[PDB]
Amino acid sequence: DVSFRLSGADPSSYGMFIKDLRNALPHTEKVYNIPLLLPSVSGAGRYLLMHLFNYDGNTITVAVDVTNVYIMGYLALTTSYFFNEPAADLASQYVFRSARRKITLPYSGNYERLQIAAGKPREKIPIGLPALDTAISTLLHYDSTAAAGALLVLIQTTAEAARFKYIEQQIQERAYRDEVPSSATISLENSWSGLSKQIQLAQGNNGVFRTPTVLVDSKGNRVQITNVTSNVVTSNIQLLLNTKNI
Numbered sequence: 001d002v003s004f005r006l007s008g009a010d011p012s013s014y015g016m017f018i019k020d021l022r023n024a025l026p027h028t029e030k031v032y033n034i035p036l037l038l039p040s041v042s043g044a045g046r047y048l049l050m051h052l053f054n055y056d057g058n059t060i061t062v063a064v065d066v067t068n069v070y071i072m073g074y075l076a077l078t079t080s081y082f083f084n085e086p087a088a089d090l091a092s093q094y095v096f097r098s099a100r101r102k103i104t105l106p107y108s109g110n111y112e113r114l115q116i117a118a119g120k121p122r123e124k125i126p127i128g129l130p131a132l133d134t135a136i137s138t139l140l141h142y143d144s145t146a147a148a149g150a151l152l153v154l155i156q157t158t159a160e161a162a163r164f165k166y167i168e169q170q171i172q173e174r175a176y177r178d179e180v181p182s183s184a185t186i187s188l189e190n191s192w193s194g195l196s197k198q199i200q201l202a203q204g205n206n207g208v209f210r211t212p213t214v215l216v217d218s219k220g221n222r223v224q225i226t227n228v229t230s231n232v233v234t235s236n237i238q239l240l241l242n243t244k245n246i
């Protein structure tokens with residue numbers, strides 16, 4: 001399991017949690033020196049439990065699919081909650097079985113659907129450690145509309161940060177003051193699958209991508225990534241979604 005406590009949190013303890021999160025995800029190969037997530041894991045071992053603690057010390061446990069870093073659901077006191085999707089329904093067969101009741105959320109977990117539920121795109125939702133503390137607090141009592149925005153915050157500050165070093169740094173910059181994510185941050189989130197695939201295809205194409213990935217950079221500039229020499233590959237991405245899952 002991994003943990004994170006918002007109480008006394010600072011850019012350092014958060015960095016440590018994101019490092020623990022990455023290290024809990026198993027792999028047997030690296031591709032261009034980036035851990036490659038497994039094609040599949042059977043039964044219970046497919047799911048990592050993140051124990052998160054708000055500023056006052058109340059807690060939820062979030063179940064994470066170790067093969068794609070997708071949040072399946074969470075446990076808040078004696079009630080479990082899972083996205084309305086087959087992958088989550090399957091996870092409910094393994095985690096949080098001892099909850100007194102199980103609620104299916106009225107939405108699945110993808111960004112589009114959560115943004116519909118929440119009533120706004122995530123461009124307009126501040127993120128940061130204080131927002132994570134709010135997220136946690138909200139998920140403590142069922143409210144599907146408020147939960148959608150809380151889950152948007154929670155996915156970005158846990159899974160998207162484990163995936164990209166830049167996004168981890170964005171959150172650390174927002175340790176004591178939330179801010180909406182940069183468009184670069186949005187771009188990386190949206191390109192994770194594409195990048196993971198192009199890095200894997202470069203293995204037999206001499207480090208050249210078969211198809212270029214278009215990103216937005218820090219300065220807000222649109223740019224093409226075409227081979228493994230890019231800073232995105234060499235420094236930024238920390239985890240590759242296996243092409244068997246794309």
Ligand SMILES: *[C@@H]1O[C@H](CO)[C@@H](O[C@@H]2O[C@H](CO)[C@@H](O)[C@H](O)[C@H]2NC(C)=O)[C@H](O)[C@H]1NC(C)=O
Nearest residue numbers: 206207208209224225226227228229230231232
């Ligand atoms: C591999 O990617 C690099 C970019 O990371 C390409 O080099 C850049 O692209 C053009 C020049 O062709 C310039 O806009 C950049 O400033 C270049 N940057 C650097 C650091 O060289 C390179 O052309 C690509 N190689 C292949 C074979 O696709």
Ligand SMILES: OC[C@H]1O[C@@H](O)[C@H](O)[C@@H](O)[C@@H]1O
Nearest residue numbers: 069070109110111155159192
């Ligand atoms: O690429 C992975 C991401 O896909 C998004 O559409 C989902 O909303 C995220 O939960 C998931 O982590």
